[PDB]
Design an enzyme around this catalytic site. Sequence first.
Site, mmCIF file in Angstrom:
data_model
loop_
_atom_site.group_PDB
_atom_site.id
_atom_site.type_symbol
_atom_site.label_atom_id
_atom_site.label_comp_id
_atom_site.label_asym_id
_atom_site.label_seq_id
_atom_site.Cartn_x
_atom_site.Cartn_y
_atom_site.Cartn_z
ATOM 1 N N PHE A 67 11.496 0.652 -2.790
ATOM 2 C CA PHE A 67 12.192 0.638 -4.109
ATOM 3 C C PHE A 67 13.575 0.315 -4.034
ATOM 4 C CE2 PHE A 67 10.729 1.673 -8.116
ATOM 5 C CZ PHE A 67 11.693 1.455 -8.878
ATOM 6 N N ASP A 68 14.346 0.882 -3.230
ATOM 7 C CA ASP A 68 16.013 0.733 -2.945
ATOM 8 C C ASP A 68 15.854 0.413 -1.345
ATOM 9 O OD1 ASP A 68 18.636 0.475 -3.035
ATOM 10 O OD2 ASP A 68 18.998 2.386 -3.776
ATOM 11 N N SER A 76 2.371 -1.547 7.113
ATOM 12 C CA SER A 76 2.751 -2.747 6.127
ATOM 13 C C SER A 76 1.500 -3.726 6.528
ATOM 14 C CB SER A 76 4.191 -3.487 6.309
ATOM 15 O OG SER A 76 4.260 -4.317 5.480
ATOM 16 N N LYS A 130 4.110 6.785 8.456
ATOM 17 C CA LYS A 130 3.444 6.314 7.222
ATOM 18 C C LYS A 130 2.213 5.799 7.868
ATOM 19 C CE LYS A 130 4.383 4.137 2.984
ATOM 20 N NZ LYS A 130 4.646 2.922 2.041
ATOM 21 N N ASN A 159 7.344 3.349 9.798
ATOM 22 C CA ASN A 159 6.286 2.481 8.876
ATOM 23 C C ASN A 159 5.246 1.493 9.843
ATOM 24 O OD1 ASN A 159 4.942 0.551 6.951
ATOM 25 N ND2 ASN A 159 6.686 -0.317 6.113
ATOM 26 N N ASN A 171 0.232 3.895 2.685
ATOM 27 C CA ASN A 171 0.670 2.320 2.347
ATOM 28 C C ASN A 171 -0.222 1.696 1.422
ATOM 29 O OD1 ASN A 171 2.637 -0.004 2.363
ATOM 30 N ND2 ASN A 171 3.188 0.565 4.453
ATOM 31 N N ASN A 212 1.782 -7.302 -3.178
ATOM 32 C CA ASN A 212 3.017 -7.677 -2.972
ATOM 33 C C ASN A 212 2.986 -8.174 -1.429
ATOM 34 O OD1 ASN A 212 4.384 -5.986 -0.646
ATOM 35 N ND2 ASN A 212 3.263 -4.681 -1.973
ATOM 36 N N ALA A 264 9.090 4.411 -0.506
ATOM 37 C CA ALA A 264 9.850 3.173 0.264
ATOM 38 C C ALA A 264 9.648 1.820 -0.380
ATOM 39 C CB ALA A 264 9.369 3.350 1.958
ATOM 40 N N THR A 320 3.137 -7.835 7.442
ATOM 41 C CA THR A 320 3.902 -7.898 8.756
ATOM 42 C C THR A 320 2.912 -8.126 9.854
ATOM 43 O OG1 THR A 320 5.525 -6.358 8.028
ATOM 44 C CG2 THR A 320 6.015 -7.377 10.094
HETATM 45 C C1 LIG Z 1 6.680 -4.295 -3.865
HETATM 46 C C2 LIG Z 1 6.639 -3.432 -3.091
HETATM 47 C C3 LIG Z 1 7.274 -3.250 -1.742
HETATM 48 C C4 LIG Z 1 7.031 -2.158 -0.991
HETATM 49 N N1 LIG Z 1 7.793 -1.832 0.345
HETATM 50 C C5 LIG Z 1 7.645 -0.948 1.082
HETATM 51 C C6 LIG Z 1 8.460 -1.027 2.170
HETATM 52 O O1 LIG Z 1 9.381 -1.822 2.362
HETATM 53 N N2 LIG Z 1 8.423 0.202 3.172
HETATM 54 C C7 LIG Z 1 7.334 0.965 3.091
HETATM 55 O O2 LIG Z 1 7.022 1.847 3.974
HETATM 56 N N3 LIG Z 1 6.483 0.802 2.072
HETATM 57 C C8 LIG Z 1 6.681 -0.238 1.066
HETATM 58 N N4 LIG Z 1 5.732 -0.425 -0.024
HETATM 59 C C9 LIG Z 1 4.694 0.655 -0.234
HETATM 60 C C10 LIG Z 1 4.859 1.709 -1.132
HETATM 61 O O3 LIG Z 1 5.951 2.412 -0.744
HETATM 62 C C11 LIG Z 1 3.759 2.819 -1.403
HETATM 63 O O4 LIG Z 1 3.363 3.207 -0.080
HETATM 64 C C12 LIG Z 1 2.503 1.935 -1.850
HETATM 65 O O5 LIG Z 1 3.104 0.905 -2.846
HETATM 66 C C13 LIG Z 1 1.722 2.769 -2.940
HETATM 67 O O6 LIG Z 1 2.788 3.073 -3.988
HETATM 68 P P1 LIG Z 1 2.050 3.608 -5.819
HETATM 69 O O7 LIG Z 1 2.152 4.652 -6.222
HETATM 70 O O8 LIG Z 1 2.716 2.607 -6.775
HETATM 71 O O9 LIG Z 1 0.568 3.256 -5.569
HETATM 72 C C14 LIG Z 1 5.887 -1.261 -1.006
HETATM 73 C C15 LIG Z 1 5.197 -1.344 -2.101
HETATM 74 C C16 LIG Z 1 5.411 -2.406 -3.230
HETATM 75 C C17 LIG Z 1 4.613 -2.295 -4.529
HETATM 76 C C1 LIG Z 2 9.364 -3.824 -16.324
HETATM 77 N N1 LIG Z 2 9.471 -3.833 -14.743
HETATM 78 N N2 LIG Z 2 8.991 -4.699 -13.865
HETATM 79 C C2 LIG Z 2 8.966 -4.207 -12.578
HETATM 80 C C3 LIG Z 2 8.589 -4.815 -11.155
HETATM 81 O O1 LIG Z 2 8.058 -5.768 -11.201
HETATM 82 N N3 LIG Z 2 9.108 -4.059 -9.956
HETATM 83 C C4 LIG Z 2 8.711 -4.530 -8.829
HETATM 84 C C5 LIG Z 2 7.414 -5.477 -8.283
HETATM 85 C C6 LIG Z 2 8.121 -4.060 -7.587
HETATM 86 N N4 LIG Z 2 10.033 -2.959 -10.050
HETATM 87 C C7 LIG Z 2 10.362 -2.572 -11.529
HETATM 88 C C8 LIG Z 2 11.249 -1.180 -11.384
HETATM 89 C C9 LIG Z 2 12.526 -0.563 -10.852
HETATM 90 C C10 LIG Z 2 12.634 -1.809 -11.848
HETATM 91 C C11 LIG Z 2 9.690 -3.202 -12.780
HETATM 92 C C12 LIG Z 2 9.979 -2.771 -14.118
HETATM 93 C C13 LIG Z 2 10.730 -1.697 -14.728
HETATM 94 C C14 LIG Z 2 12.135 -2.048 -15.607
HETATM 95 C C15 LIG Z 2 12.648 -1.394 -16.483
HETATM 96 C C16 LIG Z 2 13.598 -1.632 -17.132
HETATM 97 C C17 LIG Z 2 14.484 -2.849 -16.908
HETATM 98 C C18 LIG Z 2 15.531 -3.210 -17.734
HETATM 99 F F1 LIG Z 2 15.259 -4.204 -18.517
HETATM 100 F F2 LIG Z 2 16.270 -2.094 -18.397
HETATM 101 F F3 LIG Z 2 16.555 -3.691 -16.922
HETATM 102 C C19 LIG Z 2 13.581 -3.642 -16.246
HETATM 103 F F4 LIG Z 2 14.354 -4.981 -15.903
HETATM 104 C C20 LIG Z 2 12.650 -3.314 -15.351
HETATM 105 O O1 LIG Z 3 4.572 -0.950 3.648
HETATM 106 C C1 LIG Z 3 4.738 -2.024 3.229
HETATM 107 C C2 LIG Z 3 5.783 -3.432 3.208
HETATM 108 C C3 LIG Z 3 5.423 -4.299 2.251
HETATM 109 C C4 LIG Z 3 6.370 -5.435 2.405
HETATM 110 O O2 LIG Z 3 7.715 -5.229 2.620
HETATM 111 O O3 LIG Z 3 6.051 -6.430 2.289
HETATM 112 N N1 LIG Z 3 4.749 -4.315 1.304
HETATM 113 C C5 LIG Z 3 3.725 -3.306 1.259
HETATM 114 O O4 LIG Z 3 2.838 -3.321 0.467
HETATM 115 N N2 LIG Z 3 3.937 -2.344 2.211
#
Ligand SMILES: Cc1cc2nc3c(=O)[nH]c(=O)nc-3n(C[C@H](O)[C@H](O)[C@H](O)COP(=O)(O)O)c2cc1C
Ligand SMILES: Cn1nc2c(=O)n(C3CC3)nc(C3CC3)c2c1Cc1ccc(C(F)(F)F)c(F)c1
Ligand SMILES: O=c1cc(C(O)O)[nH]c(=O)[nH]1
Length: 371
Positions: free
Chosen positions: A62-63, A180, A234, A177, A263, A109, A60, A183
């Site tokens: 990511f998208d 986090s 989670k 969730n 998390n 983060n 979670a 929050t």
């Molecule tokens: C930038 C970022 C945003 C995240 N946002 C969420 C989120 O919106 N909801 C959630 O349940 N977990 C969130 N997570 C937690 C991740 O899904 C995951 O539980 C944790 O980062 C461990 O991932 P890892 O394989 O990179 O160690 C977030 C993590 C990161 C780094």
């Molecule tokens: C290098 N990198 N840094 C990242 C980062 O900081 N995050 C967030 C903090 C959570 N997520 C990602 C991943 C989903 C993108 C990060 C990537 C992969 C990446 C690959 C290719 C490109 C492109 F050039 F092809 F478009 C790019 F822009 C970025």
């Molecule tokens: O579950 C979560 C949520 C967030 C966030 O959206 O800020 N960040 C995390 O590291 N874990």
Amino acid sequence: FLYDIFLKFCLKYIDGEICHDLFLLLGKYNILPYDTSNDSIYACTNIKHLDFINPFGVAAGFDKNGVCIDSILKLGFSFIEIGTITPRGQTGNAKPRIFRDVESRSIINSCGFNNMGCDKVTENLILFRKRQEEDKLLSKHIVGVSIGKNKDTVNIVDDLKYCINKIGRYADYIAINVSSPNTPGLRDNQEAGKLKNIILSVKEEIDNLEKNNIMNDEFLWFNTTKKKPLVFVKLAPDLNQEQKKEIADVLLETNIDGMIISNTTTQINDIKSFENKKGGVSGAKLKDISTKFICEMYNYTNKQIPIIASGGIFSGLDALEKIEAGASVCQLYSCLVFNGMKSAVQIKRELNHLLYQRGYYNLKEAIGRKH
Ligand SMILES: Cc1cc2nc3c(=O)[nH]c(=O)nc-3n(C[C@H](O)[C@H](O)[C@H](O)COP(=O)(O)O)c2cc1C
Ligand SMILES: Cn1nc2c(=O)n(C3CC3)nc(C3CC3)c2c1Cc1ccc(C(F)(F)F)c(F)c1
Ligand SMILES: O=c1cc(C(O)O)[nH]c(=O)[nH]1
């Protein structure tokens, strides 16, 4: 492969979120790579009637808004967890809010559940489900939805209920969730009593979608399973034997379909470049912590609750460690940040190759094999 050239640049020079938004944008316009190869049937896995073509999905966060589901999944993942979403959109905490130290392959983060809100994201997934209905390469892929509370909401249940009613019928599973760090007071609901009321309300709200239909169940559930979404929770690595045996009891009594471990953690202190910054830490340094938490919760629940692994998973070995600890499936986030596209192809071959050398007929043979 070319993207791996781009990566070592985007990591040196560009801010994380900008790199993040670009990757989402590339996938929005369908210019990401595709893995069209057969996954080993020897590596499939399941959680009850959720059948996973392979044991690796995207975690979670990511998208968050379900605008890039197709392209990421077509990259070679068996499932994706969108969210965490909240009923109405939020901008999140103040930017900049994500920092990355390549040396420890870790991230910190404090995003704060930034999202466009349930109504808009639901419409995005409705669109996806219509494309999934027409594309075989997406035909067997599972989409779960992570749900949480708005920062200022008083009662969590009320937020969870709204989401289910609006999006519940398009999700294959629901991730609760309560873990986090970014929050305020959100991890106070991990308490056993409030968690019980939440869980039973989530499962109940999902149950009510069925009853008030005139249509069949094929047409009610517009998702891969064409079935009711499961209810996962989670859990945070920020728990304690007591509170881990508190929750374990609730999970056992409420018949939770699974638990996502874990998390981010607010306990990593030896990272020099992140000193004095706020947020939760992700990545490799959370691996051992997360694995230990899997062992405990796998043990505390007498293996009755399937575990979805998350935390510091980068290599096939790391995944197998989570699986042998008791996990049925693994989620990646940081690995994709540092390794890019190859992540799925690479980790799947490593896991398959390791299962071969270490003697296993299939993956289920490996689940919990350390115990
Ligand atoms: C930038 C970022 C945003 C995240 N946002 C969420 C989120 O919106 N909801 C959630 O349940 N977990 C969130 N997570 C937690 C991740 O899904 C995951 O539980 C944790 O980062 C461990 O991932 P890892 O394989 O990179 O160690 C977030 C993590 C990161 C780094
Ligand atoms: C290098 N990198 N840094 C990242 C980062 O900081 N995050 C967030 C903090 C959570 N997520 C990602 C991943 C989903 C993108 C990060 C990537 C992969 C990446 C690959 C290719 C490109 C492109 F050039 F092809 F478009 C790019 F822009 C970025
Ligand atoms: O579950 C979560 C949520 C967030 C966030 O959206 O800020 N960040 C995390 O590291 N874990």
